[model samples]
Target: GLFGAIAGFIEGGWQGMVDGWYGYHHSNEQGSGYAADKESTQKAIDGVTNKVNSIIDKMNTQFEAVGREFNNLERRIENLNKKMEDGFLDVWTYNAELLVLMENERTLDFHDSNVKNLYDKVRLQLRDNAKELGNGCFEFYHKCDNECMESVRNGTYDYPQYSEEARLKREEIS
Candidate 1:
């Protein structure tokens, strides 16, 4: 009878511990429901952040592309302006040389036939040199000059057309 009573008491204690553990687990489940809701809210916030970041990246890419295009256009305009300036200078130099040669011919005097012949040869050589140097240069200048004159006649001075030929010639030399 004593052993049976002890066994019964032990069974009752074990049942009580199981009941307490069950209660603890039930409370934990209830608390975790609230935590689950918070977790879902955090997930929603993360999704929104990702979407915003994607939009910002797209905007940055577009802005960079636009900047690149503008830079390319600016460079092309600068090159054209430089070519026009070069054409002007080439024309001025050729014209100045021609003027000097003409003046020399009128002013210089030679007494003997041999001296005259020598002077003529030298003048011819100078003229040839000037002609060779001024050949393609004049064509570019004429194109630029014509455009300028036309603009003046029309009462408008639009930027002159760049000589691709001159540009190519320069490129070849370099």
Candidate 2:
């Protein structure tokens, strides 16, 4: 009876050892499979990160280009404004000079030859001055500058018509 009990206990221990070995092997396989899956997931994440970084770099370059274009446009507008201001001043000065000349009637009288000759010379100078004033007004009205001069020159805005209308209106009011 004692020998039979010992044999039965030994058999039970052996069976338990076999079961423990099988469980360890199964756990190791599952762990290795999980490790492989984690590695694949990490690779996928890295690829996505690279793609996103590339797109962000492209967007930054595009924004820089837009900013440069805007700066150029601003500079062009500033230049145009300066030209218009200069043109206005030229017109104003010419008009004031003409008014002064017209107010002095002795300059226009054709009685004395010397006075008449002087008047003719003055008249010619005034005509030239008037033409210069008209040119300045045209430049200002069209907003012509270095950047837009070609377009202004080619544009058909009827500068003579504008001058005539302004002259008529001023005469009517005066």
Model 2 agreement with the true structure over 38-116: per-residue lDDT tens digits: 3333444464466556545654333322123335559887677668778979997997688556533322221122222
Question: Which lDDT values do the candidates have, in the order given?
Answer: 0.35, 0.35
Pick the TM-score winner: 1
Return the TM-score for each candidate structure. Answer: 0.22, 0.20
Model 2 clash number: 0
* Model 1 ranges off by over 4 Å: 1-73, 109-174
Residue 70 C-alpha lDDT in model 2: 30
Clashing pairs in 2: none
Q: List the residue pairs that clash in candidate 1.
A: none
Worst 10 residues of 2 by lDDT: 20-29
Tens digit per residue, CA lDDT, model 1, 100-162: 575444322211222223223323422312122221111222223333433332334422343
